[PDB]
């Protein structure tokens, strides 16, 4: 019997850029419009029921984070709905605040176009009333408003160029904060289980726990909803630990081994 912590993967082919990393395949994203694509899901890495160290579970469709138990009765995935919806809500509020910022800039781009077209229509009438309808003092005063306009356009250009770079960098940065936020939540679900089980279960190191005692589907949920009666299975666990004074030799195959629970584990696992 064994419980595993894992996460979601699927046939998605959407790619986001972080600052340090480009074309990163994520499971859920969102296109903002101007080439800006924000990650919402997590790093899409599809794959003996392995944990979360070298894979994401394509078989876990119920959420983002979850477990994959195994015991006498049977086995199956079970996404943590509390965890997943917390992540979803957090990310959604983030994504929305971005949409909000873009809104003002769109409204800004809108108003500037409005007033820009007003001025030119005003400059035009001035150039026509300087024909149809001290006189020379009104001319160079008009040509001064014109020169100020082109200086205005150069100004709007520069601001636009800057807002674009800051918009991109904002996404590249928020995409890292998101992917990291995911890797955080997943570890938190692992430490939480690790805390409850204690020595009643063996850390496989691949993101899963091997029980020293038989844990039925009821017990599996005690590990999930955080009510694992540790003293309950304590003895038969304490037994099965010692059931299995120098040590033996590590396999000679050009791989570094570390000594744990009286067995040789790879150093490339830690």
């Amino acid at each position, epitope marked *: 019997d064994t419980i595993c912590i894992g996460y979601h993967a699927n046939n998605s082919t959407d790619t986001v850029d972080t600052v340090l990393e480009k074309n990163v395949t994520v499971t*859920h994203s*969102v296109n903002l419009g101007w080439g800006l694509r924000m990650v*919402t*899901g997590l790093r899409n890495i599809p794959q003996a029921i392995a944990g979360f160290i070298e894979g994401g579970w394509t078989g876990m469709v*119920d*959420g*983002w984070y979850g477990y994959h138990h195994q015991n006498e009765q049977g086995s199956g995935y*079970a*996404a943590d*709905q*509390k965890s*997943t*919806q917390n992540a*979803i*809500n957090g990310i*959604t509020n983030k*994504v*929305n605040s971005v*949409i909000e910022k873009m809104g003002g800039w769109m409204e800004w781009d809108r108003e500037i176009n409005n007033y820009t077209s007003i001025i030119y229509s005003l400059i035009e009438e001035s150039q026509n009333q300087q024909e149809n309808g001290i006189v020379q003092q009104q001319n160079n005063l008009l040509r001064a408003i014109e020169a100020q306009q082109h200086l205005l356009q150069l100004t709007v250009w520069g601001i636009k160029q800057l807002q674009t770079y800051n918009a991109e960098l904002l996404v590249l940065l928020e995409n890292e904060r998101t992917l990291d936020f995911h890797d955080s939540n997943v570890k938190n679900l692992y430490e939480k289980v690790k805390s409850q089980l204690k020595n009643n279960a063996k850390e496989i190191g691949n993101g899963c726990f091997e029980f020293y005692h038989k844990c039925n589907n009821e017990c599996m*949920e005690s590990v999930k*909803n955080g009510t694992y009666d540790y003293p309950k299975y304590s003895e038969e666990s304490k037994l099965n630990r010692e059931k299995i004074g120098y040590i033996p030799e590590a396999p000679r195959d050009g791989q570094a081994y570390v000594r744990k629970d009286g067995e040789w584990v790879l150093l490339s696992t830690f």
Partner: antibody, heavy 122, light 108 residues
Framework: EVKLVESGGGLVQPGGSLRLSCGTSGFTLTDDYMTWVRQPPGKALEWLGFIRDRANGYTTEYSASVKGRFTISRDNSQSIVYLQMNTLRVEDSATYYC?????????????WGQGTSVIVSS | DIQMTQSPASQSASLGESVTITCLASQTIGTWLAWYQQKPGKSPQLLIYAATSLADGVPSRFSGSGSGTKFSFKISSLQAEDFVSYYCQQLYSTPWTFGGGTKLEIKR
């Protein structure tokens, strides 16, 4: 915010047909499991069905009380879900809501529409 | 194909008193259960999901518990707005069926 709005309710005679609409308005992170729900005045809620998005094959599900008779479907480029109802009985007279979960993964219906009234009588 | 018997159908209590609404599921559901609140002439509103988790912007008096086929729903201290209708729903397997409901009323 996200906002659901129904339309297409009104007076319809027995045995006839009617086509409701639900228009998602606002920045949605995903508009996938769009479910239809009805509620006769003074009575309880009743789940009719849902329809996945384009990103899941537009598949649908129903109940053994309206399957075949009703037909959930969404527009190809309008972002509206529809409900084609056929041979409407008097018992079908009720407020019709549309509701879907907040994000991916349908844990519960977060967003609802104000509802639209269907009345089946001569 | 999956039944949801929600009881009681109506309850009476004063302000501050605690009320608990059960919801028995025919087949095994696990944690796939939600709870709503419908004010008169308004649409339902999500309160609890995943059997125990509160939706955002929901008070702490509201709380859900239960797993498998037997689910509860408490309100710590009742208030003026709380005396409306409440429904439970299952989303484990299609059809996502609702319970009968429960109409609360003030005890005067």
């Amino acid at each position: 915010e996200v906002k659901l709005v129904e339309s297409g309710g009104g007076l319809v005679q027995p045995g006839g047909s009617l086509r409701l609409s639900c228009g998602t308005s606002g920045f949605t992170l995903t508009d996938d499991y769009m479910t239809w729900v009805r509620q006769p005045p003074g009575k309880a809620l009743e789940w009719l069905g849902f329809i996945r998005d384009r990103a899941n094959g537009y598949t649908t599900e129903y109940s053994a009380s309206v399957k075949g008779r009703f037909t959930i479907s969404r527009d190809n480029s309008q972002s509206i879900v529809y409900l084609q109802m056929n041979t409407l009985r008097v018992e079908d007279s009720a407020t019709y809501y549309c509701a879907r979960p907040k994000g991916y993964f349908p844990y519960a219906m977060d967003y609802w529409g104000q509802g639209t009234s269907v009345i089946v009588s001569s | 194909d999956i039944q949801m018997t929600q009881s009681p159908a109506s309850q009476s209590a004063s302000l501050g008193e605690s009320v608990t609404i059960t919801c028995l599921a025919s087949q095994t559901i696990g944690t796939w259960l939600a709870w709503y609140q419908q004010k008169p002439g308004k649409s339902p509103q999500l309160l609890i999901y995943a059997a125990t988790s509160l939706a955002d912007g929901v008070p702490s008096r509201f709380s859900g518990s239960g797993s498998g086929t037997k689910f509860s729903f408490k309100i710590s201290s009742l208030q003026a707005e709380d005396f409306v209708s409440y429904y439970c729903q299952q989303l484990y397997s299609t059809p996502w069926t609702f319970g009968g409901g429960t109409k609360l009323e003030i005890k005067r």
